[PDB]
């Protein structure tokens, strides 16, 4: 993509297009689909420890940002463009998991209900690290609790996955640029 | 409802009618007597440091543009075109010499002046009086050590006087530390609570911490962690509470410089705060140097809250009686290493931001307490804030304000709601002053 | 609107202003004069049989905890903490000796008493008067053969007297059958209708069945199926209608013991009901034994409805003028075989539950009739309920109440709305009684 | 708010209080004084040409059924059953001899009469007076060259008189062209704007076009394209503005027969309009023949707008103060080739329909201007409409009405809001007339 | 999954994880995807008779439950945990289909519009019945009617499918535990 | 499908069922999935020029209709059943793309955020034109802008795709019958 011509496209987004448009490996797309479907199943049933053990690499960066609204023509204002809703290493994810599982987490009774919908899966091996797998996918996440509270989240996920212990592919990076600037879901206390 | 006569807050701030968290007519009345009258947080110098830099902010339900002028001052204006009322600015921050309306193209300067009108000569000739068509300006804009507040009411006390006895407690961290920076952009989330629910919680609620935040205390291993599940009460002399004439107040938890930050930041922070404290002893005295590195949970009346040391900075932006838009920034000390500033900012959001696991513990408490204020059998019920009543003092030789010399109590609720009731029942600042001429006596009764 | 003077329901209940289904000010007024004054369904013995068992229920827009006491009685309390008003219980049912608030940890007993306060000695000392801080208790809680109702108004008539002439019709099934059980949990769905729309429909609307439910009648092959598409009118003597002083009423469709249940349950039910009827002849007489196995469509004023024999049990929980939360339980006879109870419960939900195909036929009718009450040209229009007027009787030797001796009519609408208007225009029970001293005369005019 | 006394629109229509776009009490008041009093667009002959053809339409927040009678006339009725108020018709268009209610099966004729009641003889006997139970009929239904308008108020002026001086401008296209057809079905979209925002924009806002629609002008290459980004001002004599006693008004852009249509339709349209103009010169004179092929942006008070030649036809259906349901049809000249009609209709929707790229340019302008009317600091602020004031004329020898002899100005805003204020402050048509006895003098002051 | 460690996980949910984590058959996942996409197409166009004929086995149990909200720590209260929004055999499904198709079903005029989104498909053969196919999938179901009524449903489906007449795979069990306790969709009159 | 028996089914819908129920080609379904996922990626990052160049054929008809609500039993009223929300040739799509990219499109600052979810993909070659590929798919489209504006669109897409320049498969027809009659999304200014 020529971003001088396609005026609305960011350099970052153009780079990610390039990644999937070349060596298409159908088998890889299917492996990636299985991997993400299984991850979502573990999360949906709130098997957070199993998620960490089976899906999350020790070197993970799990990051969800919220970008400040700026003018399309802005060229002078240079201050921090985004904040981190999440920017977690493995230990920080573990803290969040223990918080979910704590019997004095009053908000988790009655038990929450999660349903995740994973679509638009794309996969490509890294060019330089032949053991690094880039996976892109979109998620709709439905959270229901307490009779009539319903929150629906929507996001694109830029992932890197790598073979870890026992040869199991695990998440080493997730990046989400959350599309809604002001959340209308009470909080973002869900694992996208 | 007759707001001159209706007792919404009982004598000494001992209780409040539950309807205050739910009644939409009262919410509309608060727009006039609370939000249009009092000082509201806008931004920090650090977010608009250069000429032309601007941000948008809410003041009550109104939106304003807050702009750094060429002379180094800051002016704020309604984000509303003077022609046919279109919203002028649709972004949150930027740098510009002015703002052009997307409807008919009127151009306003960063100074609010109407500078250009398309085809003015051919259309209006000389008949448009542009001098009288500047953006509606916020009457008062003042700074407290870089933190910029606005007030629509020209009659308000200066910001420093408005902070009253709270200023003394804030100064060690806000001034004597060498200054703070606000790290943006903020997180923004809507909760289904009245703005007063989180405001009252931050101003004076240490009681809730061990129980509400049991899971976060147990999971994060922060320094206040001994409190998890009410397993332990803070020792005597662990802290105090204070409140002030114009409603601002806070809790002080002695020495708690690492605040809510998980064990990963505790040693670094406790080292940094202790080192600066040692330098400050010589400058401002032992007590005030200790306050600098003590955890302050504060509300600057009406709807700006913070946790110093933890570095959490909040605006509870009102939407309706059961809807509030929560803005969350991080505050850092300017002379901290940049890498520490970055980690501290992430940790503020990790704990109290949009996916803040501590802040999440508070959701149901704030939302249901607010929503219950609409329920028929609860409207005329009494919310209690009597803990510690009869043991508060005023005029203490060491700690100013109305002060409860204990870590956990409801002193700061009482002062917050005393000021709230005096405003709701008053038509202007002069009437508030008359209604507040015995404010500390009322709070220290029995 | 002046509710003392405004004629919302015309003389003899012949018509009602359409605005009653849409006006939010009137909805707010109903919270006071209908829901805070009258008996409202809570639960059944079968759902809280053991000490410590509790459920939550709505009473109007308020939520209550309904708890089985150690002495075998039932008490109900506002689901609102006495400290700062947080919702105490977040589940629908359970068993506990008490309830602890998730905000500051106050602990209330199943008897509503404030039993514990964290760190009470250190914080409050001896100054907290816990005896005065019990949960706000529902003043009146009474049982009709296991069905538990509550009333916030201490001045209400006893539940049995409140049921008035309706009790006689309910007793064969509720009492003489050996007793009913409520099968939970209920289905719960929000519809965009006023609570009065389904309440009026169940109290007295046999006219709608053949047309509204044409498709369900034709598809399910239940015993009322001859009615599909108005293909046939019920024969003379097929049924009757009744109403009562305090607003409760019902239709009676003779012998219709299998009700709305599809052909898969018809032979089994018709056998079971007929067998019990034969035993009941000797105990309560032929007429009342026949009533036992006759289909009753009833509303217990204001917002509890049922279809006996079909086994449908409804609460129309009010949310606002055009929003109602529908709770649907199944009622079964205790001495039915367990497998029959299970199939009957599923069939109740199949027909009238959240995916009830019969109940679905009613959605547009109730929702649009309610929403039209907000439309400008319809607010002051008259909803008609004159069918059968001038042919009702009172004091009949065989059937008590105001009675229309025909299967299809609007007798029970008239009694429902007569009571509704008497409440809306009254400030208390004494005034309702004064406004109702000629209730049956008004209904039997012409 | 006292609508007799409150100055919502200043003298000569020079300004309006911003609250008019946001205040819900005023919205409710408009239902009475604007929508229940004035002429509202229903349908076109072309959409209900045959006996039995009907459509549903909104009149204010009410819904009506508009039906072609056997005698060739059109009658309109509330879409509300006379029994218990259910919505009778759930579709948008069709052909039928009557309408049966899905609740209890009452059957109404296309003439609104109650024709049948299920089992009437057995249930009501002779006691139901069906003659008095016809659907509530719209009092006035009149046609302007096939365009059908309704009015609930029997006292309204005839539609032709109500159009006042605007009729003269519309006639060349509506009458002398041989007649128009409305191409349905319309697009339907909800916007978060007050109905007055798009109404005022279409009645008189040429100023916004070059700036608001910069991107659409630049991208589509239509004939008004020289305006993109305010790159060029229309030459002198490019057009005029007009307004009238009862509030209708329009802009005239000379010769702009291809309007907003992209270059793909420009040559064909400019040929067609020019050819008909040459024929019309001999019939109606050069000026009026030129008006025929000139672009008119018009609002027929209160909430019907159009762009002639572009062929856009709009209804701004009110929902609440910040919600409007936008209906968009295409108008075509009957004697255009069918293939041209089809392409013109698609082009109308392409530019101004639900995905109309021009209409999209207006969204934020209308929505934010409306929503700002709720904001506390803006409610009492003044929206300006003074452009061109002091240069309008009345009684001109060539162009009737209050006329601004310039293409861009606010003449038509002033007339629209003068009529609006006279209605809001009046209880009936007689009072409006009294309040309007010097209407043109007020508008041409200075 | 160890549900003593993963405290939020139900025994039932842990059993279903186990089913798909073992013999992964890629071809089976794709067969299951086709089967469910075709079923959803038939339902979306309201071909309810075709759905019964082509997709639904004679021995079907079609079940959607609503679970009462109970405390996470509850151990004493033992009464019926759930009610059946649906619990249908083939004849009961047929009744519902005839109700939909009846020309006096006034609610179906004007014609409703359905759009279904099926994601997260997993498939595994039963261990003991080699002719029984377990299929898990999530659905978003959008129903639009009467101008401005829009209802969106979200659910996970636990299915069993088996080869029936002509060798065509048909649904013999569907189980849905509906995630929202109080419905905000007017009713649940849709086939999930 | 027999539409005399399946009373709710339109002749058009029955014809489209027939198309996918016969020669199932698994490889084709996967090619179609890739094609649609890549198209959605280009649209989501607002690479509208790239979308035209890579995804849209010169002979395209891009059509979204809104159908007037009529009685199920209606047989007499014969006037235009639908209007065209979109009915675009390539040049008309280009106009819309230039409108999106214009620096004076004030509504595009701050930059919009799009997330698309493509599901239920079916593919079949045309019987008579062996170079014409029929693709059916459903889309959820999430558009977020200006802090708190969120609009979600739902639709089924009937596409025809054909190999064009360089052998790249491109859209030659898209047809959507939009399921909601009155839009509650401010506008339909999104490419479904
Ligand atoms: Cl961390 C902390 C300590 C004391 C009081 C507090 C009030 C509110 C939020 C956090 C607090
Ligand atoms: Cl099934 C039945 C019979 C008679 C009257 C009814 C009223 C309401 C619902 C069902 C009824
Ligand atoms: Cl295209 C055009 C020209 C002049 C005035 C207008 C007002 C509204 C919409 C379009 C207009
Ligand atoms: S509304 Fe801003 S220029 Fe007109
Ligand atoms: S609100 Fe319940 S203990 Fe404080
Ligand atoms: S409401 Fe129309 S027939 Fe009864
Ligand atoms: Fe807290
Ligand atoms: Fe019914
Ligand atoms: Fe415009």
Tab-separated table of C-alpha atoms and ligand atoms in Angstrom, chain C residues 201-202 205 208-209 212-213 352 358-359 361-362 365-366, chain D residues 103, ligand 8:
chain	number	residue	atom	x	y	z
C	201	UNK	CA	-55.464	-9.440	29.733
C	202	UNK	CA	-55.157	-12.250	32.305
C	205	UNK	CA	-59.779	-11.243	28.415
C	208	UNK	CA	-58.763	-12.232	22.506
C	209	UNK	CA	-57.999	-15.952	22.683
C	212	UNK	CA	-54.664	-13.478	19.074
C	213	UNK	CA	-53.788	-17.121	19.673
C	352	UNK	CA	-45.971	-19.134	28.242
C	358	UNK	CA	-48.585	-18.626	23.102
C	359	UNK	CA	-47.149	-15.715	25.091
C	361	UNK	CA	-48.742	-14.070	20.235
C	362	UNK	CA	-49.488	-11.375	22.838
C	365	UNK	CA	-50.789	-6.437	21.245
C	366	UNK	CA	-49.470	-5.479	24.694
D	103	UNK	CA	-55.996	-8.351	19.351
G	8	LIG	FE1	-53.035	-13.979	25.192
